[PDB]
């Protein structure tokens, strides 16, 4: 294991990027929300929907997001979109965890 030239194995650290999000519901727009995680040899991570798993090696039907972050853009906001964003990452020295939320109104 390795920093980038030198011999240190740091554990994981993720976060929730400012732990309350929210959204106008039923207009059918696009909006951004994240728990960015960092490690180093680099990290794995995955998070839920208040229980059932956003995996992004398979749950993707309105979502898709950038590496070296957890920037999950989700289309088309309607109602349905509120959640609690419970995130984990682990990585080759260790493991770490956080929670966003995320209050979608009807006007």
Same mark, same amino acid.
């Given at each position: 294991?390795?920093?980038?030239?030198?011999?240190?194995?740091?554990?994981?650290?993720?976060?929730?990027?400012?732990?309350?999000?929210?959204?106008?519901?039923?207009?059918?727009?696009?909006?951004?929300?994240?728990?960015?995680?960092?490690?180093?040899?680099?990290?794995?991570?995955?998070?839920?929907?208040?229980?059932?798993?956003?995996?992004?090696?398979?749950?993707?039907? /309105?979502?898709?997001?950038?590496?070296?972050?957890?920037?999950?853009?989700?289309?088309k906001?309607? /109602?349905?979109?509120?959640?609690?964003?419970?995130?984990?990452?682990?990585? /080759?020295?260790?493991?770490?965890?956080?929670?966003?939320?995320? /209050?979608?109104?009807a006007?």
């Amino acid at each position: 294991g390795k920093d980038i030239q030198v011999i240190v194995n740091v554990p994981p650290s993720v976060r929730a990027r400012q732990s309350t999000m929210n959204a106008t519901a039923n207009l059918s727009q696009s909006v951004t929300l994240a728990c960015d995680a960092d490690g180093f040899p680099e990290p794995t991570m995955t998070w839920t929907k208040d229980g059932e798993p956003i995996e992004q090696e398979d749950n993707e039907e /309105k979502y898709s997001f950038n590496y070296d972050g957890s920037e999950l853009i989700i289309k088309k906001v309607d /109602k349905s979109d509120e959640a609690e964003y419970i995130c984990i990452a682990e990585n /080759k020295a260790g493991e770490q965890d956080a929670t966003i939320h995320l /209050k979608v109104f009807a006007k």
